[PDB]
Ligand SMILES: *[C@@H]1O[C@H](CO)[C@@H](O)[C@H](O)[C@H]1NC(C)=O
């Protein structure tokens with residue numbers, strides 16, 4: 001099971 | 015690797031063995047993604063619960079190996095570590111989430127028939143291949159069972175990606191989006207799994223769009239080896255690819 | 266409990282069942298040490314990796330039970346929790362060191378033929394009975410195997426304490442002096458172990474000096490259930506007795 | 517003197533032994 | 544600035560030699576049965 005969305009490295013969203 | 019089978023020569027040229035220097039010991043699997051970079055799990059380099067806290071000098075890697083019970087001269091290569099990079103959000107103080115790490119080699123290894131880099135998934139590959147039922151390949155020199163018991167030749171096994179809800183209900187352990195699980199279900203007739211010594215190794219898939227091999231996961235963890243109702247967990251490589259690219263570009 | 270056997274009525278009158286209220290669920294074992302206090306493992310009340318973080322109201326305990334598939338009227342008793350006390354230096358992040366917790370009951374339970382407190386060890390009992398080879402008794406309602414599978418009657422098994430060196434080398438997990446291990450060695454003929462559901466339960470021994478039963482351990486953790494080469498680990502109750510006495514005296 | 521702890525009403529208190537305590541004593 | 548190098552994922556002793564390994568077919572057949 002997996003998504004094509006990346007894991008965030010921050011604090012500094014959209 | 016439990017319930018796997020011998021691998022053909024040159025079948026996994028990006029396979030990498032991570033060794034503790036002294037006492038000499040096979041610690042984990044790893045993969046070659048370029049002539050100077052090796053990918054592996056972070057828990058293989060840093061995991062205090064097992065009093066595992068390594069620095070570049072404690073370690074070493076062997077690339078291009080096929081059989082342990084033999085020194086393939088002019089074939090296998092050894093490389094020292096220049097720098098270890100553990101994922102910034104990796105926190106051993108829980109879950110093993112973001113269990114990925116890079117290792118810059120002191121000197122670039124020469125590619126050959128038996129040594130060759132694997133690819134990192136592009137969005138298309140991840141979008142279409144990361145689905146329940148699709149099989150990937152896990153390879154390594156880890157234990158042959160959860161109990162010699164150590165292979166002489168690289169082992170290999172193909173396992174199907176499991177539906178997230180099934181992974182979730184298969185363990186009391188909270189799992190995250192940065193992990194996916196693989197393994198046959200109880201009563202699928204088939205078996206196979208990674209075992210101690212395989213962690214950090216790659217979970218690859220062959221793209222039917224361009225015939226290239228892509229590393230979708232990194233053997234991360236499991237409760238036991240090849241137990242019915244349990245599945246192996248893998249670091250979702252694509253989700254963490256930006257970090258990988260950041261490190262390699264910036265260093 | 267794996268490879269154990271049915272227990273006789275009134276054989277372990279200090280046995281306590283810890284239940285999650287909703288969904289109704291047997292969470293762990295526990296022991297009665299007085300009419301208002303129950304002893305158990307801390308990881309049973311607080312263990313984030315399993316998203317386990319209970320408060321007094323989520324829980325409840327049943328004392329004096331023999332069979333689950335039956336309501337022993339006028340026999341078994343239920344008690345609500347007034348306060349939970351986890352050991353201040355309890356380490357869930359690393360190796361479950363100091364895995365002990367106390368639970369004060371809202372109301373004092375009535376002793377009877379089936380509900381009776383167990384003794385806590387004094388220095389003489391601990392010094393003489395905590396020897397490698399000496400056997401203790403582990404009891405609980407946990408799984409019957411590492412794979413219904415859930416007993417109907419309280420299970421019991423006797424296990425021998427193991428030399429620290431064998432324990433230490435039996436796992437990659439760093440162990441501390443606040444825990445001791447128990448279980449038969451591979452090829453001793455016998456087997457047995459605690460399994461998921463027995464945690465927090467007591468490991469008792471009968472003093473040959475005053476014929477009283479003393480709880481020397483608390484089922485804590487293990488890698489699987491009844492595997493060859495592996496042993497179950499227990500919270501060394503004596504080493505932590507001062508904390509227990511502190512809590513009870515001071516509250 | 518520890519209260520009555522460790523003495524089971526249906527065994528020690530009645531001069532009776534359960535089926536496996538001898539296994540402990542013998543160890 | 545990099546999703547798998549230029550020659551990445553193409554095994555010298557296999558793809559490069561129009562040869563297949565003993566089990567790659569199993570993977571290919573799992574792509575939506
Ligand atoms: C890693 O272990 C080393 C060598 O034992 C020690 O000096 C250091 O404190 C450890 N790393 C950290 C900061 O946790």
Ligand code: NA
Nearest residue numbers: 197240241244
């Ligand atoms: Na499995």
Ligand code: NA
Nearest residue numbers: 491492493495
């Ligand atoms: Na065992």
